Amino acid sequence: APTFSAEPCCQLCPEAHDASRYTTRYQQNFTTLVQAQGDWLFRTREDLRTEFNTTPAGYKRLQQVHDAFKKRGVELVVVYQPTRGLVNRNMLNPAEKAAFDYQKALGNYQAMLKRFASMGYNVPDLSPLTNEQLAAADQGKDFYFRGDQHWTPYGAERAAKIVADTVHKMPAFEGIPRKEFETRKSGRMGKTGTLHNVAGQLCGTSYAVQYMDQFATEPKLFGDSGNAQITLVGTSHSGKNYNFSGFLEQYIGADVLNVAFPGGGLEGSMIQYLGSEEFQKNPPKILIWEFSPLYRLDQETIWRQILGLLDDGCDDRPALMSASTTLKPGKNELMVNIKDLINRNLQMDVKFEDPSVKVLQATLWYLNGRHEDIKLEKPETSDTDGRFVFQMREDEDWASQRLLAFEVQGPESGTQKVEAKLCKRNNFAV
Amino acid sequence: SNTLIPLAMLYLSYPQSNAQQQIDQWRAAGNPEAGLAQVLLYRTQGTYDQHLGEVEKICKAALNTTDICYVELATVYQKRGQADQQAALLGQLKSAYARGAVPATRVDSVARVLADRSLGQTDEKTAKELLEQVAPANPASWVSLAQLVYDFPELGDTDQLMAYIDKGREAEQPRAELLLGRLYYEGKTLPADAQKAEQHLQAAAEAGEISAHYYLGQLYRRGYLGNVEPQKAVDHLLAAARGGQNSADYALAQLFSEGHGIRPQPGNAWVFAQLSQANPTPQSAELLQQLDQQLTPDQRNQAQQLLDQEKRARGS
Ligand SMILES: [Cl-]
Ligand code: NI
Ligand code: NI
Ligand code: NI
Ligand code: NI
Ligand code: NI
Ligand code: NI
């Protein structure tokens, strides 16, 4: 006889619109949260941006990386994720839907894709997936999770179809063995989204878990396969949770070696793979690289490492100077130079005996006390190689400065074995 | 005669009248249904597990006149781990069913006793072999087989399980719809499919099973279909509770407390935690105390009003 009713709770509190409150570094990727239909939230600065550009130094580095891979015999397929705003604007509430300049953001996103294409990169055109309006039969299969930054598996599959179109038109795909695959629903996942968590602690509220289908891809006498000739480098977006590499195998029709891992960001997965012996003994014909507009494309310490690695660091090569030392806490002088060691012709290769070393903090000493302080950090979300490879600095006048010494900061306590070689670069050969 | 057993059922079912001494008089007087009556006394007073040896004596005496004792003996032998006596009993039961002396449903109930994990170590393979031999003459046992294979995947894959459910869904047993709903709900022998779950659970709930209501309530509460549906969750959980599922009440108290997309309402959570106390748990009373300390006296009084108005569920 008595009636008991229940209500859906909790529009974003007005206090989350206050940019003052996103103080920590983590919170800064969410500034600011806005409420949309259902419990869709959006981050204004990252999801609703209209600008997809980098600096000229960035474009020059991207061009060099393309050309260096090409000399190693690798073609690159750039998967440049369109934003949550670009794809799911139609879930916005009317006010934000009318303030978001989708035509400008669409044009600038397409322009950055064309820029990538201009440097030689193979660029699958993902703009047709923006302005998503799902068919009635696909009502719940949104490109993005409502309160999280990752695509759903359905978003990944849709991107994979276009990527496979690009790969089939590629001359490098010739000679790559073909293989059939079968992809099936395998289970269900529940996502507590990052946006919902940040919202929840800003407003003292609570969000429902969003459930989503998981998928799995299986290969369907001498029918076993050799080594992959396509490699996928990427972030958490390419991890097991969303089956991006499964869908790529399914629609390309070929094996795909997946070396992504969460927390790798723009360069972690790439740096770890380039240092690997898999890449140096079985370099792929096609490397698919997955990232998004979230990452600055003008960090010089990233590309000095990627370019050093594309030249194979310092091995199979005469050393100019070498060190085999036990670091102690404090400053440790590994090498002291006579010979005219010109920054623009040099690279450093540093391996720690202990593979758990994630940080290299060091100083390159030049004439009259001019010094470069370097700090290279490996991701803490994957087993990494304890190896740091980097070209000397070449911007401004640095390219001509002569190298005098190299020192390395020791551990807070204990001792650590390290080996360091200084060598000349070759021109990205074998 | 059907005389002493209904009379004992009367003397126990409403003690407005000793019963053990009346059974002892009927036994000392040598009336053959005395032992069945005292077994009934054991079951109703909750002492059955304390007198298993005498249950065996009585039913082994009465077995050839009272086939329900086939179920009783089996229970004893499952409780006390007696595989030898169980083999002998099942041999005489297969014989009796061959001779036409025992109906197929009695075989079905014995098989379901053999697979009752709550009795000790089960004999699920023997259960399957009995059910498969009486299923052609007793279609309900198809569903029994479907459930057996479900609890014991050892004995059959999902294709085998579905063959059983189809042979039984010819009789369109509502239990079959309930089993399909649970199969798509629980994601145990198959990947979970919330839509197929919802469909088969809806079929089951329209046909009788209030437990389908519990599952539908949980389904709308969590949002496995993609969205939480608060009112549907409340309605279906409430129907389950009003039908005799205790876990429903606690569920509702959780629903009105935890947020997670449903607006917390402390008073109604209170009502349902109190209802959940019928079979209390630590978590039950702990939620009840937190909620109670969260309310004001006027809120508490209005909540007591709904509580009393809901215990006014005639339900008979
Ligand atoms: Cl039973
Ligand atoms: Ni090219
Ligand atoms: Ni194609
Ligand atoms: Ni993840
Ligand atoms: Ni300094
Ligand atoms: Ni109730
Ligand atoms: Ni919670």
Author numbering:
A (entry chain A): 29 to 248, 256 to 372, 378 to 470
B (entry chain B): 138 to 154, 159 to 457
Reported in the publication:
Alginate is produced by a synthase-dependent exopolysaccharide secretion system—a conserved molecular mechanism in Gram-negative bacteria for manufacturing and exporting carbohydrate polymers, including cellulose, acetylated cellulose, poly-ß-d-N-acetylglucosamine (PNAG), Pel, and alginate. Synthase-dependent systems are characterized by a membrane-embedded glycosyl transferase involved in polymer synthesis, a cyclic-di-GMP binding protein that regulates polymer synthesis, one or more periplasmic polymer-modifying enzymes, an outer membrane-linked protein with a tetratricopeptide repeat (TPR)-containing domain, and a ß-barrel porin through which the polymer is exported. In this study, we focus on the alginate proteins AlgX and AlgK involved in polymer acetylation and export, respectively. The AlgKX protein complex reveals the molecular details of a crucial protein–protein interaction involved in alginate production and provides fundamental insight into how a polymer modification enzyme and export protein function collaboratively in synthase-dependent secretion systems.
To understand how AlgK and AlgX interact at a molecular level, we co-crystallized Pseudomonas putida AlgK without its native signal sequence (AlgKPp33–484) and full-length P. putida AlgX (AlgXPp1–479) and determined the structure of the AlgKXPp complex to 2.5 Å resolution. The AlgKXPp complex crystallized in space group I 4 2 2 with a single copy of AlgKPp and AlgXPp in the asymmetric unit. In the AlgKXPp complex, we were able to model eight TPR motifs (R3-R10) in AlgKPp (residues 138–452) and residues 29–468 of AlgXPp. The AlgKXPp structure reveals that it’s mainly the N-terminus of AlgXPp (residues 30–37) that interacts with TPRs R9-R10 of AlgKPp, however additional residues outside the N-terminus of AlgXPp also interact with AlgKPp. PISA also calculated the interaction interface to have a buried surface area of 1015 Å2 mediated by 12 hydrogen bonds and one salt bridge. The side chains of AlgXPp E35 and AlgKPp R404 form a salt bridge, while the main chains of these residues interact via hydrogen bonding. To understand how specificity might be conferred, we next examined the surface hydrophobicity of AlgKXPp, AlgKXPa, and AlgKXPs. This analysis revealed a highly conserved, hydrophobic patch on the N-terminus of AlgX that is buried in a conserved, deep hydrophobic groove on AlgK. Examining the surface electrostatic properties of AlgKXPp, we discovered an electropositive region spanning 44 Å across the surface of AlgKXPp that extends from the active site of AlgXPp to the concave surface of AlgKPp, from R9 towards the N-terminus.
